Amino acid sequence: FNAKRKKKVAEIHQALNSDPTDVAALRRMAISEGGLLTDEIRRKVWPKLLNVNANDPPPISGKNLRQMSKDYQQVLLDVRRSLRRFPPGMPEEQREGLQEELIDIILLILERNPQLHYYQGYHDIVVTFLLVVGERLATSLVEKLSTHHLRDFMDPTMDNTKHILNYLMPIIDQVNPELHDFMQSAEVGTIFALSWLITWFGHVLSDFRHVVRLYDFFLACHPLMPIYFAAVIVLYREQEVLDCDCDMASVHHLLSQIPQDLPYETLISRAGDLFVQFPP
């Protein structure tokens, strides 16, 4: 891994220096084993990946941001209960500062973009960026995301999101028709992936290093990628979904209780190939 990783850092650095930034090779490096490695590499790369300029001045945060924002109470509520997403190590004083930061990023983005609607779970995305890019960079990058990749999650209603969730089943059917038929018998639906799709598996995966490496992968690919990643997980879990009672409670709870040790790097490659094989 070491020499192979050493090469990757040199590869990633060569691509940032290229006469025009070799975004193609950065996406390619992001999809390959290990992602973008250090968060420091990410501070450079992620902005390139989203087309937001890294060297722009910060947005103006007006006088009474929290006071006038309709979404203060809800956002505050969710941030309070975001505690488990912070490193166990970092002290309360520092953590609370970041949490106070986190509330302000969200409320600003929501202000700058009036058409966007807050949803429970959005905070899991913003906090991921906040801990990699940092407050200044996180605020601009997530805005871009909020208007493209997460654009549908922030519609007034849940309509488009529901529709996206529905994809999961036609995908399973393409790769394992029998499994698709078992799940429909049970009437599990697709609401087990809601947490997954809406927070980029950030609400659900405990290990932060694995979450950011997934964000690497999601930034480089298509907006709908997370669902093909959901499908790949269910498929990987075939023998447990079948070897299980065929009633909603049993199957919903099973899938709902997501394994902590997934073969991330194996699943990502499957997600990729499945996307290209059955495109949206």
Partner 1 sequence: PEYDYLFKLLLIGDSGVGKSCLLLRFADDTYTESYISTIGVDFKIRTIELDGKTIKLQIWDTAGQERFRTITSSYYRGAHGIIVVYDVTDQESYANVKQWLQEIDRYASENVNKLLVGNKSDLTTKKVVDNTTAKEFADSLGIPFLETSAKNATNVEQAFMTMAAEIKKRMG
Residues that bind partner 1 (CB under 8 A): 74, 77-78, 80-84, 117, 119-121, 123, 156-158, 162, 189, 191-192, 194-195, 198-199, 203, 249, 252-253, 256
SS3 55: coil
**What's the rounded Cα separation, in Å, for the pair 87 and 95?**
9
Between 28 and 162, name the residue whose CB sits nearer to partner 1. Answer: 162
**Shortest Å, Cβ 185 to partner 1:** 16
Distances (CA, A) of 14 to 18, 19, 41, 48: 6, 10, 12, 14
Between 196 and 264, name the residue whose CB sits nearer to partner 1. Answer: 196
**Shortest Å, Cβ 28 to partner 1:** 32
Distances (CA, A) of 218 to 27, 150, 213, 215, 272: 10, 11, 9, 5, 10
Do 231 and 174 meet the contact criterion of CB atoms below 8 Å apart? Answer: no
Between 75 and 274, name the residue whose CB sits nearer to partner 1. Answer: 75
CA angle, residues 178, 180, 181, in degrees to nearest 5: 65
The residue whose two tokens read 């919903």 is 252
**Shortest Å, Cβ 145 to partner 1:** 18
**What's the rounded Cα separation, in Å, for the pair 272 and 264?**
12
Between 196 and 228, name the residue whose CB sits nearer to partner 1. Answer: 196
Distance of CA 248 to the CA centre of its chain: 27
**Shortest Å, Cβ 273 to partner 1:** 28
**Shortest Å, Cβ 101 to partner 1:** 17
**Shortest Å, Cβ 156 to partner 1:** 8
* Burial category of 83 from C-beta neighbours within 10 Å (exposed 0-12, middle 13-18, buried 19 and up): exposed
Between 119 and 278, name the residue whose CB sits nearer to partner 1. Answer: 119
Between 176 and 199, name the residue whose CB sits nearer to partner 1. Answer: 199
